[PDB]
Amino acid sequence: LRFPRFSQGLAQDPTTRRIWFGIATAHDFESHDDITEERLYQNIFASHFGQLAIIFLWTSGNLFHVAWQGNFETWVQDPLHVRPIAHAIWDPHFGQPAVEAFTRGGALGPVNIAYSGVYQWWYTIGLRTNEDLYTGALFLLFLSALSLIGGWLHLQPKWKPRVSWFKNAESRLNHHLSGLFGVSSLAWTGHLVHVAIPASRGEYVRWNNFLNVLPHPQGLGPLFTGQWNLYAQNPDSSSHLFGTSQGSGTAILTLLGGFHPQTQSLWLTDMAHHHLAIAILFLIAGHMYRTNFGIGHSIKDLLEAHIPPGGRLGRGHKGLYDTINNSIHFQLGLALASLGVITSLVAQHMYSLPAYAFIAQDFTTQAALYTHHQYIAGFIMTGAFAHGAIFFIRDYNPEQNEDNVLARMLDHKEAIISHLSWASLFLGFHTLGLYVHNDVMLAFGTPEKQILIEPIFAQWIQSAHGKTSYGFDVLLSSTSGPAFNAGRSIWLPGWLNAINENSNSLFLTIGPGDFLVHHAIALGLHTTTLILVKGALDARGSKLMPDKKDFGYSFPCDGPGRGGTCDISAWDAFYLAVFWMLNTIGWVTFYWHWKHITLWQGNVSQFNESSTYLMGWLRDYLWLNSSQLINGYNPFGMNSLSVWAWMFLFGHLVWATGFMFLISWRGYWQELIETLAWAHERTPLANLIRWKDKPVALSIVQARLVGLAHFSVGYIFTYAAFLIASTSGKFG
Amino acid sequence: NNLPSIFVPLVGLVFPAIAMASLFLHIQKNK
Amino acid sequence: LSPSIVISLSTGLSLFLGRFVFFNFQRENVAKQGLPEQNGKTHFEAGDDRAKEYVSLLKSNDPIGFNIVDVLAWGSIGHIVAYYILATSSN
Amino acid sequence: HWMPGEPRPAYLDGSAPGDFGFDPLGLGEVPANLERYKESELIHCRWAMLAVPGILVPEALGYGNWVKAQEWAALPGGQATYLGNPVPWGTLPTILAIEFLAIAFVEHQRSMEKDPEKKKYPGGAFDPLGYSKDPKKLEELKVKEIKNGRLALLAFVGFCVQQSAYPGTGPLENLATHLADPWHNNIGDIVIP
Amino acid sequence: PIGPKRGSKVKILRRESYWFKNVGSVVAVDQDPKTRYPVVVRFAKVNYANISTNNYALDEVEEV
Amino acid sequence: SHSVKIYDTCIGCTQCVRACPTDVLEMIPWDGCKAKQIASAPRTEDCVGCKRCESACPTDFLSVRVYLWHETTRSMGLAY
Amino acid sequence: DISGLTPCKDSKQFAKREKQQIKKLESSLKLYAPESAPALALNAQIEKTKRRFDNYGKYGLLCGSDGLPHLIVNGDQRHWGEFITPGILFLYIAGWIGWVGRSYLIAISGEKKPAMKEIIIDVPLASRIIFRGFIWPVAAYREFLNGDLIAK
Ligand code: CLA
Ligand code: CLA
Ligand code: CLA
Ligand SMILES: CC1=C(/C=C/C(C)=C/C=C/C(C)=C/C=C/C=C(C)/C=C/C=C(C)/C=C/C2=C(C)CCCC2(C)C)C(C)(C)CCC1
Ligand SMILES: CC1=C(/C=C/C(C)=C/C=C/C(C)=C/C=C/C=C(C)/C=C/C=C(C)/C=C/C2=C(C)CCCC2(C)C)C(C)(C)CCC1
Ligand SMILES: CC1=C(C/C=C(\C)CCC[C@H](C)CCC[C@H](C)CCCC(C)C)C(=O)c2ccccc2C1=O
Ligand code: SF4
Ligand code: SF4
């Protein structure tokens, strides 16, 4: 035996394929030699512990570097006129102009400007000095050490959990719902009330005095007597200055709604009340399922009894408890789908309802956060469907799942796939046709012939929320409606003030260009879903390959017979859907960035007029906004944007290098490598050296992955460079 | 400070060399 | 301004309703939805040592078998209702 | 038959009281579902045959229509009235508490019954005058009860709908409006504005 | 005689077959007892291999 | 070595054993088809995984199947 | 005023667009003799531009802040000519084409070699079938009622 230890088949490969495939199959515990279920579960547990340790170390490193090399104490005094510092630069390759150019902020040497928004987040939660950040970093280092220690302990024979413990679903659901959500959110309200709210009013509360300072003048008396309205009295005034006692109040729980007048962000007393309410809701809900105390629900009986008596769903949900409980890919897919949905929601909500002070005025940070979270959500959404296909291949049992909801989906896969195809074709046809018609109309110098369609439904929905720029006068926009009268004394004043102010990002005004780009987004989503669903459902076989389940999740082809069978596996269906995900997220981020750039420059009419034809996009977004970026270094000198131009070109080069592995396939290269072996063996003074692994071309599936990684890395780096350079050159 | 003048070369030139040598010796080993 | 000490009499009413009215319905529904099980075996009998029911807490000398868990659950419901009533007033 | 010349569903044989084969959507196909539906229909009919006297009589005595009697509870501190006399306990949280407890007991008592016949016509103590002594008269009585209940349900639907077209008005007010000028004060104007 | 008579129309009940749930015509039936798939069926449409004839057992064809 | 399997839907055409570029497959006598023959796969250590045998099979779905498996010097076609 | 829009006839930006287009066209005409053919073509272009702007003014379209017409597709009766009527006409034509294709495909399905009638069209049969699609809605609906629309 030799590397890999966990594969007898791989360890006997006489070629270089032994190393590549040894690296790529390390974390697939199910396919290792002499693997059992208990060992699988225990390895997963240890890996989770390691992941937590890595996360804690990452956060500790960020905090330590900001405390040691940043300008946090200078930024706190004048947040709007200081640039945050990420860390310092020490590059022996730098020249003197590079040393001078990157010396920005208040530093004594080259530094990097942070665009992750950690400064605003930490300032909002009450951190004020570099001593606080050092303590936080030390605490997180301790937490990482504790996580590693806990990871090592449960791999010992005395402390190994059993498989039955891992399959106790009701106890885990109860404990997670009640403590990991309810108690976790209850404690954050405590931190807010005791530390963060006093800090925003000029009060310094730390470990040495937090037992003597009352968060409220009346103490806990109102809480136990039910006089809970005393905690909302005397809120902060509109003339409040954040961080000082000028114009401050004494309330700790309010329902004002809207934004803080100065920081242009949510009130700190609204978030505490929100977290308290959700903590109570989560604490109550964690008492549903049955444990060894003799009361509660049983999930299996809940599933088995939800069958309609009409028979239109067959046997219903019977047998689904054991299907989910015995498959880990099913659980991973469900978790990934939920996580991706909530990540997209986080991205959509953070840009329009900012929570951190002075982050709405930082234009570069907002775009970076939005793009980051949207790309991550897209990748997670692809992974959900990938693991659904893996479940259908490896874990599904037809006999236990007879005629239930899961089995009837495989029965009519053709209808689902064909209807998805119809929707995609319809959307693509008409969207492209309208765009090309508008382009041709602009080309002939007659813009009045364009097809411009108002997004009436979205404008009506915006009016129903209290916006008065369209004159629809419905619901919340109606002063005499019951809905308006219900909340007019609680939250409507502040919300209506915020929604009818046009300098923020709360319910931006929309037009025909928004309509066209929204339908493009819909086309992208439908096509990606079509690809992934077709890959998942056809995983066990089709007419072209009835026995696909016998060949695994990933395999090259079934050869040139029967007309040829390239890309017939479900893995190849996942591989083709990454290109569509990247395209869709690119469209979404292009739309967001152009709209917000035009909004920030105060010339929204440019987007309104130039977004109805594709030449408008190409000329007024890409060509126009890339002038500063491509001038980072020129024959006349360099400035602080040099690194972003270099990364722009680097991303272009990495993206194009991926096309080599995607367009040219293996048999060209194995023949080319065969001549080099002869050349080396016949060369004097060099044939005294010989290899140990026989050199070979990459495998058919390897080159698909290697090409796709190059494509994604180039995409990400190029867009990140362009976005950051374009935003920071104009707005700093 | 003077610390970056040490740790940057330590992490960029010394540790990669040690790790690559050890890993190559590990992957080339047989019994 | 209703007093908080009196309003907590809702606990007594909730306990009365649980002990005299809805006892049979709750008991028969709990009997119908048995212990959770995996692969046809309960969690404890499948191998999980920490899933064993506490039989010592099931035995109560009440003539109809009223437990302490029932007391806790109905008291929690009564307290929640009473504090909702208290918070709704004085607004 | 509810429509001559139309075939009947197989499960509607014409032996049940008030059975005329009306089931275009086939909601009674499942034998367990159809048994429940008869109980629900009878309960709805019996509840609606008490509402109709309770809506017209207070309006016929000048005490206000049936939607005016609910206006006071939306206000803070509103007190209930009966026959023009305020009742001491007519506060909102006193009324809500006594209604839930009194009803939750009887309906749960009805729920625990397991004999299908007693869920519709329980008999026993609820028939003090003994009208169920004759099985021959009883069938005629059941037909009469079913035929009246559906009419009362239709009347209640009319009550509800007529309110939307004429807000703030009572059914007797609508009848008085119609009687004065039948040929212009009718449904036609509402449908075609 | 064994199985369907020649010229009759049968439908296929083999899941891994290209003509699953399709109707074909019987050509011949081998009468040897030791043969496992004695029914010869032909179809109007060709499969992915441009073949139009296949052999089936008595349990994978039914008279339509 | 790769895995080559034969199923009893075989008709004895010989076309798979004529197509193999290395001697992996051969005909043996049998009873169960008109031809009184079936393919056998005695030498799968010499299989390269080309699937020429599966392109030649006239059965609706193949009576010969090749499953790719652990790779060796012979199965990679290396003459280095 | 749906969505805060204004009629084209009252829009000043619409008139400014018309004036700019006409002025751009007129600057090219000064380069040619009035009797020459290019002058005649430019005159025709100017007249057509004026007529197009007048026609857009007459039909009751709605302009935005840029002076460009916008289409309302919510179903309002005042703008049924923008989306509803052309949509119904397109649906009729597409149903005609699809019904004719389906009828021709069914007609030749019973032949000895139906494939050869697809690469070499049988002109008389198609010509006889072409006229039949003029009443496609009635035939399709009656086929749906009789259950012959969906294959068994
Ligand atoms: C009170 C009891 C309790 C608690 C606290 C935990 C806690 C945990 N268990 Mg656990 N467990 C328990 C009882 C408990 N268990 C019992 C009784 C059993 C046996 C039935 C188990 C069995 C068990 C297993 C088998 C495993 C765990 C694991 C875990 C860890 C998962 C990490 C996680 O959820 O990320 C934290 C996530 C959240 C807090 C919520 C994420 C989603 C929310 C909505 C996001 C909120 C975002 C919010 C806006 C803030 C973000 C913004 C901010 C950046 C500013 C976590 C530490 C896993 C593990 O190994 O971890 C080490 C694991 O594999 N547990
Ligand atoms: C810009 C490049 C591009 C374009 C235009 C498309 C377009 C399309 N892809 Mg696609 N794709 C691309 C790149 C592209 N892809 C890449 C890089 C990948 C990764 C490998 C994929 C992977 C992919 C998958 C996996 C799938 C698609 C599908 C589709 C189709 C669904 C969208 C739709 O509604 O049709 C848009 C309509 C059109 C483009 C029609 C234009 C027709 C004009 C009029 C042709 C004119 C002809 C000519 C001018 C006249 C004769 C003259 C003579 C000289 C020819 C669509 C045709 C899906 C599909 O086919 O299923 C439905 C599908 O499943 N694509
Ligand atoms: C499958 C096609 C499809 C898809 C996926 C979408 C998707 C979307 N549309 Mg949309 N739309 C469609 C067709 C479609 N539309 C058509 C055909 C019209 C013209 C009537 C519109 C008109 C329209 C408007 C005016 C607006 C949207 C908007 C939106 C977005 C918000 C969701 C919404 O309001 O749904 C709307 C859903 C529908 C209208 C249902 C259409 C589905 C049917 C099956 C289409 C069939 C065509 C039908 C036969 C036409 C008959 C007309 C004939 C009598 C003349 C969402 C991305 C809104 C938005 O945010 O834009 C920025 C918005 O304001 N759409
Ligand atoms: C394949 C497969 C799989 C996977 C799957 C998936 C991945 C899916 C996804 C899915 C999804 C991803 C879904 C989603 C959904 C969503 C939703 C369903 C939503 C909803 C919403 C709502 C309902 C709302 C509401 C509201 C309110 C409340 C208020 C305001 C207004 C509104 C309307 C907004 C599994 C593993 C499982 C199994 C195997 C196979
Ligand atoms: C001996 C006896 C008797 C009596 C008895 C009794 C009297 C009992 C009682 C009992 C009780 C009396 C119980 C209680 C309980 C309670 C509870 C269980 C509570 C809970 C609570 C909670 C859960 C809370 C919550 C919350 C919320 C939700 C919010 C705010 C905060 C708080 C925390 C407050 C008699 C003579 C008759 C007979 C013979 C025997
Ligand atoms: C270029 C090319 C080759 C030839 C390329 C080879 C053999 C590259 C082999 C790797 C060399 C030595 C460069 C490695 C560069 C890495 C950055 C170093 C390792 C990094 C570690 C993290 C693994 C194929 O083998 C091939 C096979 C099938 C389809 C397409 C292609 C294809 O396009
Ligand atoms: S394996 Fe295929 S090609 Fe070879 S004899 Fe059998 S049926 Fe003929
Ligand atoms: S796969 Fe190729 S080498 Fe292997 S037995 Fe078949 S024809 Fe021969």
UniProtKB/Swiss-Prot annotation, chain C:
Keywords annotated in UniProt: Chloroplast, Membrane, Photosynthesis, Photosystem I, Plastid, Transit peptide, Transmembrane, Transmembrane helix
Topology relative to the membrane: Multi-pass membrane protein
Main localization category: plastid
Residues spanning the membrane: 5-25, 68-88
Tagged with keyword Transferase: no
GO CC entries: chloroplast; chloroplast envelope; chloroplast membrane; chloroplast photosystem I; chloroplast thylakoid; chloroplast thylakoid membrane; nucleus; thylakoid
Any Gene Ontology biological process: photosystem I stabilization
Location within or outside the cell: Plastid, Chloroplast membrane
Family note: Belongs to the PsaG/PsaK family.
Record's function text: Not yet known.
Protein name, as recorded: Photosystem I reaction center subunit V, chloroplastic
Organism field: Arabidopsis thaliana (Mouse-ear cress)
Segment of the intact protein contained: 62 to 152 of 160
UniProtKB/Swiss-Prot annotation, chain D:
Membrane topology: Multi-pass membrane protein
GO annotation, cellular component aspect: chloroplast; chloroplast envelope; chloroplast thylakoid; chloroplast thylakoid membrane; photosystem I; plastoglobule; thylakoid
The keyword Metal-binding is annotated on this UniProt entry: yes
Binding, chlorophyll a 1: 22, 41, 150
Binding site for chlorophyll b 1: 2
Cofactor mode of binding and number, as noted: Binds at least 14 chlorophylls (8 Chl-a and 6 Chl-b) and carotenoids such as lutein and neoxanthin.
Induction annotation: Induced by low light (LL) but repressed by high light (HL). Inhibited by cold.
Family as reported in the entry's similarity comment: Belongs to the light-harvesting chlorophyll a/b-binding (LHC) protein family.
Subunit structure: The LHC complex consists of chlorophyll a-b binding proteins. Red-emitting heterodimer with LHCA4. Interacts with LHCA5.
Domain comment in the entry: The N-terminus of the protein extends into the stroma where it is involved with adhesion of granal membranes and post-translational modifications; both are believed to mediate the distribution of excitation energy between photosystems I and II.
Protein name: Chlorophyll a-b binding protein 6, chloroplastic
Species whose genome carries this gene: Arabidopsis thaliana
Swiss-Prot record, chain E:
Record's comment on post-translational modification: 2 isoforms may exist. With or without the N-terminal alanine.
Record localization: Plastid, Chloroplast thylakoid membrane
Cleavable signal peptide: none
Cysteine pairings via disulfide bonds: none
Family: Belongs to the PsaE family.
Primary role: Stabilizes the interaction between PsaC and the PSI core, assists the docking of the ferredoxin to PSI and interacts with ferredoxin-NADP oxidoreductase.
Protein name: Photosystem I reaction center subunit IV A, chloroplastic
Full protein: residues contained: 78 to 141 of 143
From Swiss-Prot, chain G:
Gene Ontology annotations for the cellular component aspect, listed alphabetically: chloroplast; chloroplast envelope; chloroplast thylakoid; chloroplast thylakoid membrane; nucleus; photosystem I reaction center; plastoglobule; thylakoid
BP term (GO), one: photosynthesis
Keyword S-adenosyl-L-methionine among record annotations: no
Subcellular location: Plastid, Chloroplast thylakoid membrane
Record field: transmembrane: 80-100
Topology in membrane: Single-pass membrane protein
GO molecular function: mRNA binding; protein domain specific binding
Top-level taxon: Eukaryota
This protein's UniProt keywords: Chloroplast, Membrane, Photosynthesis, Photosystem I, Plastid, Thylakoid, Transit peptide, Transmembrane, Transmembrane helix
Remarks, miscellaneous: Plants lacking PSAF have altered thylakoid structure and are not viable.
Family that this chain belongs to: Belongs to the PsaF family.
Primary role: Participates in efficiency of electron transfer from plastocyanin to P700 (or cytochrome c553 in algae and cyanobacteria). This plastocyanin-docking protein contributes to the specific association of plastocyanin to PSI.
Protein's UniProt name: Photosystem I reaction center subunit III, chloroplastic
